[PDB]
Amino acid sequence: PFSNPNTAEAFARSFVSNIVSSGEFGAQGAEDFDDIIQSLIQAQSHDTKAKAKAMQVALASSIAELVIAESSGGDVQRKTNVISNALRNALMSTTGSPNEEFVHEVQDLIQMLSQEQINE
Amino acid sequence: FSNPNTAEAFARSFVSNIVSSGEFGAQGAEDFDDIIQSLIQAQSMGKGRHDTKAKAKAMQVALASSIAELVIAESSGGDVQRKTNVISNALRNALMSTTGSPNEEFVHEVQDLIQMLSQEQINEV
């Protein structure tokens, strides 16, 4: 989905809409996701495979870190399931595919970052 | 990384340290430069209407993960410990030079991300 800058723009709009609709995040939380995803999508703009991988991981890691920073510890599993659902749905509606690898990366990153000193 | 003037200087110093290490070739150094410059622009843009502590953490993690992923991408699996040591040393010197702390929390984040990303399907060869 991060092939086309227009597909990327369309995925971002759809993901943030899925976050707003969940009822799990307030005004500021949905805005946090929007500011961060919009920034990284815009940055993702000659390409190498290595650079594409770095940008895909930067986006996955930014989403994972927001889940932790928005959560209060005990609700990380609930917010992980809500963000996983929002992601799967936006990918499926914008691409016809659920991009399970991208979702796996975000889930793995959420679990690793729940233990980093930046989040202690 | 909240101070644009510092951010830019850190980018230049870090990339200089990567080039001087001799551990990364010309393409590697180019990939690092392009990615670190994009993530600085992202750090500024990520402030949007009102900067928040949660957004600042998300953008520091995005920068750390982008560095960790290129370490994996620029090798092909084998020499990960040497490259982790060289990148950690390049980062510490660039942080000390531009801030006067080694910011070992940020460096540890990058070392943890190298460990975890070296497991992921995107990195399978």
Author numbering:
A (entry chain A): 10 to 54, 60 to 134
B (entry chain B): 11 to 135
The authors write:
The X-ray crystal structure of FlSp NT dimer was also solved and contained a single dimer in crystallographic asymmetric unit. The model could be built for most of the protein, excluding NT residues 1 to 9 in subunit A and 1 to 11 in subunit B, C-terminal residue of subunit A and loop, including residues 55 to 59 of subunit A. All the obtained structures were compared to WT MaSp NT in order to determine the overall structural similarity and to identify structural differences for the key residues. The high-resolution X-ray structure reveals more details on pH-dependent interactions between acidic residues of monomers. The most obvious such interaction occurs among Asp 122 and Glu 130 of both subunits. This interaction is possible only at low pH and requires that at least one of the acidic residues—presumably Glu 130—is protonated. Another notable contact occurs among Glu 84 and Asp 41 of the same subunit, described previously as “handshake interaction” in MaSp NT. This interaction in turn may alter the relative placement of α-helices and favor necessary interactions between monomers, such as salt bridge formation among Glu 40 and Arg 59 of the other subunit. However, this salt bridge is present only in one side of the dimer, since the loop, including Arg 59 is disordered in the other monomer of our crystal structure. The intersubunit salt bridge formed between Asp 40 and Lys 65 in MaSp NT is also present between Asp 41 and Lys 65 in FlSp NT and an additional interaction between Asp 44 and Lys 65 was identified. Based on the X-ray structure of FlSp NT, Glu 130 was identified as a promising candidate as its protonation would favor dimer formation by alleviating the electrostatic repulsions with negatively charged residues present at the dimer interface, and this supposition agrees with major chemical shift changes of Gln 131 upon dimerization of FlSp NT.
